[PDB]
Each structure stands twice: as C-alpha cells, then as structure tokens.
Design a protein around this ligand. Structure first.
Ligand code: FMN
Length: 146
C-alpha cells in the first residue's frame, strides 16, 4: 500500500521517529514492527502524534512523564498501557530519547516500544530496558544522516 517502508523502517525493531519541527511532534518514520504491533498501516500513522495509542486505562500520570521529558529534551523510560487499532490492550515499555545533530540541537525524537502482556519488574524490566536502550542507540546511528 502507501508509504512503502524505507530501509530504516525495515530495521527489525519496534520504533518510530518524530520531527518536533513539524505542528504537534508527529511520527515521520514508523518501523514495520510498529505497524504490526499497532495494527495501523503506515499511511494511518504518519503525520500523527503517537498519543493516538493511548486509551481509557492509560495512566495519565505516566503520559505526563513523557510530556515533561520531551519538553526538557531528555530521555525517559516508562511503562504504560497502549491500544491497537482494534482496541486490544498492551503494555508498552517505552524509551524516548532525542537525536541530536552535529551542533547538538535536537533534530528528531526516537521512540522504542517493547510490547508486553503485563507491567514488568526486576529481571524482565532490566532485560527489556537493556533491549530498548540498545535499540535506541542503534537508531540514533541509523537516523543520524536522514
Ligand atoms: C508513543 N511513542 C512516542 C515516540 C516518540 C518518539 C515520541 C516523541 C512520543 C511518543 N509518544 C508520546 C506522545 O506522542 C506524547 O508525547 C505524550 O502523549 C505526551 O504528550 P501529550 O501532549 O499527549 O500530553 C508515545 N505515546 C504512546 O502512548 N505510545 C508510544 O509508543
């Protein structure tokens, strides 16, 4: 269909990239795995703020932690309930970090989502955060020259 995946978006990891220069910090790249998890097509996601994944059981306190991170241009790692297109719930161990250019200005934000069936703690939380941070570092490389 529309918006065939770029090579970046075929990286076998769940992430999105947003452009904070664009009204409402919208998604501009979304990986195939993100599409698969969320049940949206790429055309349905692009140019939208990622908050469309939130729903009734999403903890708004947690959403404010993300808002504040973006506002302060800093990373955050949180867990929150998200919803697919068809309204199926999933937990999202979510890591955000800015991507900076060669003058240290924030160019994009990188978001990595690890979907799970439950809030994780201890070993599962640690291994999850290990995974999403390593992924974010990989994408910071991948995205640098877009
Ligand atoms: C979404 N992932 C995600 C990825 C990036 C790179 C960015 C910048 C944001 C997200 N969001 C958070 C959302 O877009 C928004 O920043 C928050 O809702 C806070 O702002 P508001 O204006 O709504 O108070 C993500 N949100 C999700 O729920 N799930 C993700 O995967």
């Amino acid at each position: 269909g529309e918006f065939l995946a770029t090579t970046l978006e075929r990286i076998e990891k769940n992430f999105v990239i947003t452009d904070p220069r664009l009204p409402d910090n919208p998604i501009i790249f979304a990986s195939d795995s993100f599409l698969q998890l969320t049940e949206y097509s790429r055309e349905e996601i692009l140019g939208r703020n990622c908050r469309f994944l939130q729903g009734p059981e999403t903890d708004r306190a947690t959403v404010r932690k993300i808002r504040d991170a973006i506002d302060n241009q800093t990373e955050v790692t949180v867990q929150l309930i998200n919803y697919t297109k068809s309204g199926k719930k999933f937990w999202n161990l979510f890591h955000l970090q800015p991507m900076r250019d060669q003058k240290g200005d924030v160019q994009y934000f990188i978001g990595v989502q690890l979907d799970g069936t439950e809030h994780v703690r201890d070993a599962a939380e640690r291994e999850g955060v290990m995974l999403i941070k390593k992924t974010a570092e990989n994408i910071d490389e991948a995205a640098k020259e877009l």
